[PDB]
Design a protein around this ligand. Sequence first.
Ligand SMILES: CC(=O)N[C@@H]1[C@@H](O)[C@@H](O)[C@@H](CO)O[C@@H]1O
Ligand SMILES: [Ca+2]
Ligand SMILES: [Ca+2]
Length: 395
Amino acid sequence: GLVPRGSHMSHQARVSKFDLYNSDKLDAYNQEFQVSRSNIKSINNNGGKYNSSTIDKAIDGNLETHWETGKPNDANFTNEVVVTFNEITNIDRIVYSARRDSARGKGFAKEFEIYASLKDEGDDFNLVSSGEYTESTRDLVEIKFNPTDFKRLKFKFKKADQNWASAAEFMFYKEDKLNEKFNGLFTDSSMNKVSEEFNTLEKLNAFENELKDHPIYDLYKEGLNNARAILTETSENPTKATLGQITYNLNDDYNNQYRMPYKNIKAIKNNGRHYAAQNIEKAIDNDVNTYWETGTLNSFNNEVEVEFNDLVTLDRIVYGSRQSDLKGFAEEVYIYASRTSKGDTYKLVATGAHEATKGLVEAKFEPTEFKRVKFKFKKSKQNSATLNELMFYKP
Ligand SMILES: CC(=O)N[C@@H]1[C@@H](O)[C@@H](O)[C@@H](CO)O[C@@H]1O
Ligand SMILES: [Ca+2]
Ligand SMILES: [Ca+2]
C-alpha cells in the first residue's frame, strides 16, 4: 500500500520515495507510464567520471551499476548531467537513485534543478523545476514536476551528498493523471482530512471504482481505506480503563482465541529512544524477561506506537515494566487509537492507573478498532519508561 504524496499542480518539485519499485506491479506500471529506456539516445555530463563509473551506467536499466563524477562539487563547480531523447518527449517525473554500492547514498542529489531544451545542441536550457530531499541519501525517489516536453533534460546537482555526485539510475515517467488524483486524496501531509472532491463516501467509493483498472490499483487500497476511516470516524469518547494483574497470557489456548497474533505487528517505535541495548523491539518479543527502556525520561511524556498490518478490534492492552526493579512502570496510561495506517489521526480511547507490580497488567476499555495504537506513559514510577511485553487482546 502506497500513501498519497500530496498534490502538485511555484516550480518546486514534489520529491517522495518511489515505493512502487518494491511491488509486483512495477512491470505493469512501467508498461503504461515509463519512458522506454530505448527512447534515451545519449547522455553526457560536465564532471567526467571516477574510474570505470561511466555516465552510460546512469541510464543502463541497472540499479546496481552507477555513474560517479570525476570532479566533486565545490564553491565554483556544479555537477550536471544531460540526457538526450530520440524524439521530443513529454515527462513529468524523474525516478532517481544515488550509487547503491558500498558507498551507497554518497553523491545523492540533496538539491537539484531540472532544465528543458527542445533542441539537440546549444545552451538554450530553461528552468523547469527545483527540488530537494532531506529524508535520506539511500532512497529511490520520485521527482514530480509539471509535465514538460524535452529533447534534452539537464539535471543539476545543486547539492550532492559529500560533493561526489553519483547516479545508479535516472528513469523518466509520463504523467499519470489518476495517480495524481490519488496523490490529492487528503488536504495536507497530515492526511487527516479528505479533500473536497472525495469528501463523502459516495465520492470516495466512486473514486475507488474509477481506479480499478489502474496498474497499481492494489497499492491504492490502503490510502482509500484510510480516507474511508476518516470519513466514518466518530467523535472521541475516552473512558477510564480498569487495570489489573492478569496471568491469562500464560494460557496458550486462550491466546490463540483472544490475543492478537504478534505477526500482526507491522512496526514499533517510540519518541524517547532507549538506554543501553534495551531497545524497543524487545517490548514485543514475547519474552517477559527482555524489556525496552527509554533513552529519554518523563519531563516530555514517553510514548510507544505500534502499527498493525490488519485493523483489529481490541478491548485490552496487557503490559509490564522491567521485572528487576519495576523502574519505568506506566503508573498512569493514555491509550490512543488510529484507524488509519498513516497520518495524524489518533484519538484518545482510555486513561488508566495502577500501582507498579511484578507480572503483567491488563488495561481494559471499551472495544475499539485499531490500525495503530499509541501507549502514552502519563506517570511512570521513577520517571523512566519500560516495557517487558506489550500485548493486545480482543473482546
Ligand atoms: C568505496 C568508496 O567509497 N569509493 C569512493 C570513490 O567512489 C570516490 O568517491 C572517492 C573520491 O576520493 O572516494 C572513495 O574512494
Ligand atoms: Ca545503472
Ligand atoms: Ca520482551
